[PDB]
Design a protein around this nucleic acid. Structure first.
Lengths: 184, 183
DNA sequence: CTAGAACGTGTTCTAA
DNA sequence: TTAGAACACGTTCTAG
């Protein structure tokens, strides 16, 4: 709605990501987010009705932005195979840039119940679409969207393994390009 | 001890019974302890977090399913069939009790590194049930990798069902589609 | 909106 | 082991 309100929302989401960067999920505490966005906690709950909604919107907003910084690059490589490997890689890297910030958003994303479905949906759609439109070098086909979904599922699984120290960054890229190749 | 094992089983049974009737929110540590006739400190001795607890319950249940499905999963004439079969068996198992499935799955995906060993066991029981269904025995390396991809598609879809973002039909169709793209 | 008190549940502590 | 009080943080409530 109003300019001030769009400005409060952004301030709340910048706080959340600043805090998550230094402390992960356990440090994204609602008094701390509020305090640092200079709002009372009741105002915080007016804008985001749970810690999880808050984090899934922060993750929604970060992917929207990556989606912008990704339009020429994603459509750079000369074959679908290559454009996909490239997009997977840029996204993998973006996530590895701040493990604790990634950790907070990703766990909220998979933990979210049905009351957050609409926020969880946007993030899943954005990710599917970044992959599809890179693979297809523009508007994807039906087959290319379905392939893109499978690759987002593989990505998420591997990201969760990387976060829980069950897999290294090497294991993750090996499993990802393994999946890409089996579907192209 | 037989005491230690009797008490471990009472606690996981408590956990699943409560999860059935109420899902994740209702798996409360005071309630579980009470139901298993143990004090909370004893509960935390066996399982150091609500999430360790629920991810061990999930471990024991895939473990159990694993035995229940040793002949049948290797019944279909082709890899394609055996995989589709295994996928459907596991799907129908999860769908049997949505709130039980909700509680265990959310812990499974919420778990941090402090439960990495419980999470790991569950991931590998599932990977292996799929691979061995595909293969009808010890899988090749290529069957194992395909198994992994399909467990990832499976989990993603199970979360979307749980969050009412996909129906049971939407999920069947996405699994089918993945099993085709890979066989 | 603001500042916080109050309350529930996961986790830890104290005491027998 | 037990019983249960204490404490922290997500969430809701009371007041101004």
């Amino acid at each position: 709605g109003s300019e001030a309100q769009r400005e409060r929302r952004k301030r709340i989401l910048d706080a959340t990501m600043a805090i998550a960067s230094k402390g992960g999920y356990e440090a994204v505490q609602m008094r701390a987010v509020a305090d640092r966005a200079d709002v009372a906690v009741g105002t915080l709950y007016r804008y985001f009705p749970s810690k999880v909604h808050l984090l899934v919107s922060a993750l929604g907003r970060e992917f929207s932005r990556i989606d912008a910084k990704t339009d020429r690059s994603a459509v750079a490589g000369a074959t679908p195979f290559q454009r996909l490997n490239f997009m997977v890689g840029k996204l993998n890297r973006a996530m590895q840039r701040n493990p604790l910030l990634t950790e907070a958003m990703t766990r909220a994303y998979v933990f979210a119940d049905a009351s957050a479905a609409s926020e969880v949906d946007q993030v899943e759609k954005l990710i599917d679409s970044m992959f599809a439109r890179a693979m297809a070098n523009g508007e994807p086909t039906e087959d290319q969207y379905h392939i893109a979904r499978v690759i987002s599922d593989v990505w998420l699984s591997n990201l969760l393994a990387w976060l829980t120290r069950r897999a290294s960054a090497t294991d993750v890229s090996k499993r990802l390009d393994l999946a890409v190749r089996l579907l192209i």
